[model samples]
Target: VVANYENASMAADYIKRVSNVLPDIGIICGSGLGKLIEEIEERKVIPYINIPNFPKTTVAGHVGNLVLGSVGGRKIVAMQGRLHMYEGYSNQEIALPIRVMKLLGVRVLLITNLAGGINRKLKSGDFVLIKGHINFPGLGLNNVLVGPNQDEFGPRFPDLSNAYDRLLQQLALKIAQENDFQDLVHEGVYAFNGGPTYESPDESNMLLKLGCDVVGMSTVPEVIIACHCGIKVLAVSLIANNSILDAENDVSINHEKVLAVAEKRADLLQMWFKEIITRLPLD
Candidate 1:
């Protein structure tokens, strides 16, 4: 089923009854960012099965939930795990939760993904504040929003020039500066490749030529969904490894290695986002 208005409304209604939290901010936590959800005080977790029109992925059973609570005095709803195309989730399935977030009164959507750095300046454990994106799948007619437009949600032709909000980017940057981890942050364009496999060395080289600073398999689809619905976004990428450097040195990457970096920076990212959430203007 598509994330049409009625379906999203149904899911939101179920969540409101179960959680009693009307969140202003919505967060989609990708790999390694799961700890932030754990830090939410007074959280109410609602499993996917309990919500109407929520998609089911066999691999995400029991682990998938909509978490609502307060973080740094701000009400926020978080998705515990994300659906990625690489895992065989359909575009309709991927767009549903974001539409549900919009129906639940979320004005700002914050997303984080672990990406391979394609820029020379990036290194493992660094952060890239996503300024824009290059969506290969979209160009290949596999965009997540390929289906019929939900008029209740957004325009049939939505403009994405400001998909990544400049204001939110500054707020995130300000928090990083206040904490003195600003040195680890940079602004860059993200490139999304539809894949379960890691980026090949030649692909990494091609991305560098195309001016993409980071390459990832997720985030872009979610960003497009959120943007179409008029939610401001702040996307951050945690650099798991410099793909260009690895390609040059004939080195390789794996999930085990990526998870190690995620663990290392997890707490710090939690701190930064908590601060950012509080600093966000609700009115």
Candidate 2:
């Protein structure tokens, strides 16, 4: 389990020695949303393999870089790629980096991902603030915290009622409005599916019935792990495709399409977050 504080400490120790940056904010860039690092000043980009105890990434558009730098005047550490359950990683493997972030002094987590729209009102290219989650795997007894707890990180049973920070949500919305992209911003619940495959038509319908606004294969486990350790979180999903609407229209969704949408909005998201971080009252 990532609860092995020794392993996580080893990894954190390595990052500190190399980057020489102690960040209070952590960012996990999903799919193609990693371009945010381009705007960071005085950056040190470390490969996942170079960092002791870090996992290698296999997915495309996931650069596998650990970036330490300043964005909008705030010190930050970013994961240019993330591990997933569908990649056959144990819960321990998925939790390790987040625990490592906790050890690195990260008090806030900002995550982004590409998701298929389950809500009919949503369209491709829109950004959805993750107000909450419906973790299918977690509900099926495969929760990330299923193993032994890391006593120093958090309690055995952490409260998730406020997992997604309300203040961050408001701040994100305000930023969107200020940028005149309010039409592209929304608030919704995200659903997690363990998958290398896209959801089937029936599965999309099931998600809609369950009140999910967006569905994806990542983010939930990491969010759970972060919350377990008391890290404030703000996750946003870029609507790559609307599978619920596509089911009736016989439209298809692919990785290429997902990456394309992420590409289209990458700059806007980068700008949005840059402003958010600059204006954030981190003290």
Candidate 3:
């Protein structure tokens, strides 16, 4: 499909003009992460619908606004909510913001999501620092690399072997530990499923067998798109629910409850994101 925006040049131009205040880091905030928005002191919030050619976000967890804010004493651009395939948006459309972020000078990308914890060691409201993920949704579903190549941004084909940066993981761990934040900073593989609906018990078990520690509908695509553009990526998952044990025992999932947990943990998450931002070296 031919990618059409209201005005590519207009969008590109505005993005270019913001280059001065352009943030060094970009963040993808998942469901119930809106509290981070308030923690940001100085800000410029541009609604996605108002951004030229940008598709309006229609997902349940997305806040639909592009906010430029500061945390940990560093300037950053934040996606108050992100795009998803379940919302009927194409993968490229869902990934467009990452490209825009690179253009605006983002050096690193950190993503947060609410996922079902499949690890027996993990429980609800726990935070897992993702060491890697199974790109099942991308492998099983939509392709983000659909159009002609943007050589200036990246190669025609991108490698996924090291989609999540290891260096960032090391720093993120130190930050969490130094803060005495003991929300179970487990690192493991995540499986992505294309869903507006939760996965069935059998399906969850299948994912667990495949070595998945958590399962979510987001994160993978954004990281793939970011890595394609050479942006460093780090991710965190909030265990919103316990993974389905079996068809009959599949229980413990709810959006409101998940957000409540995220809300309770928001200050800590925001502090972690901010500290990571402020302490990281630029180069």
Candidate 4:
């Protein structure tokens, strides 16, 4: 009974009627990355309140809009904000939108998020092309897909070994090289910490020991839902701060600091995705 197909189809129908944009690509904006929507042409905006069965985003820096538009001559649907488990959203609430995207002809999902660097080599304002993720919630039996499976979306137990598409990862790195920002890009594993709070010094140290390069709360659930439904995904994490790097003295962390660092790097990601969308082989 977790976010049934009927609700997903109903929501997709509402979006189709209002936006009239059949998007092949779906983008989810991370903190301070909503400006990417400003680059889209022929935009049709639908607030979450207006969309049926969509959850409201309660965090600051998340501007809550479902925007349909064209970027680099490719039709796209972008979420100006995202829901988080820390925001009190149930797993079902989080899965609904992704399923609706699947029903609306979305084949690819590009997700982005702001994260704390756990690897010593990563610095604030840099980017990591996520190679894979360690989902803490999943290990704790709080997996987003813990409920009844919607057979229409995928198998009850979906294989996630290839969750992040390799071709797209290479394409992103190629784009980085072409744009001369290769120094700021690296491929690494992301760790998902179920949190509204930033990781503690001990937790950060534990993640570093676990071999995680970056850590965040949002993208894992969404990626899981996307993978469950057979959508190709490419996720990127912008390093807002390095908890392990500063954990020696136990420095303070705040949402404002995260947003500030995210803004510093948003332009690069925006340009990268625009080009990637245009070059994606959509058939």
Tell me how candidate 3 scores on lDDT: 0.76
Candidate 3 residues 141-257, lDDT tens each? Answer: 366776676666788889877788888888998988898875568898888887878877888888877899899888888888788889999999988777755334846566788
TM-score per candidate, chains pooled: 0.98, 0.96, 0.90, 0.96
* Model 4 poorest 10 in a row by lDDT: 55-64
The true-versus-predicted C-alpha distance at residue 156 of model 1, in Å, is 1.4
> Which candidate wins on TM-score?
1
- Alpha carbon lDDT of residue 185, candidate 3? 86
Candidate models: Cα lDDT each: 0.91, 0.90, 0.76, 0.88
Error of 1 at 3 (Å): 1.0
- Identify the runs in model 2 with alpha carbons over 4 angstroms from their true place: 56-62
Q: In terms of TM-score, how similar is model 2 to the real structure?
A: 0.96
Q: Write the per-residue lDDT of candidate 1 for residues 1-283, one digit (tens) a residue.
A: 8888888888999999989999999998769778989999999999887789999865755478889999999999999867888888888899899999998899999899999999999999999999999999999999888978888888888788999999999999998998899999999999998988899999999999999999999999999999999999999999999999999999999999999999999999988988999899976
Give stretches of model 3 more than 4 Å off: 1-9, 16-20, 58-62, 246-252
Q: What are the runs in model 1 whose C-alpha is more than 4 Å off?
A: 59-62
What does the lDDT come to for candidate 2?
0.90
In model 4, pairs of residues that clash are none
- Displacement of residue 19 (Cα, Å) in model 1 is 0.9
Ranking by TM-score: 1, 4, 2, 3
Error of 2 at 120 (Å): 0.5
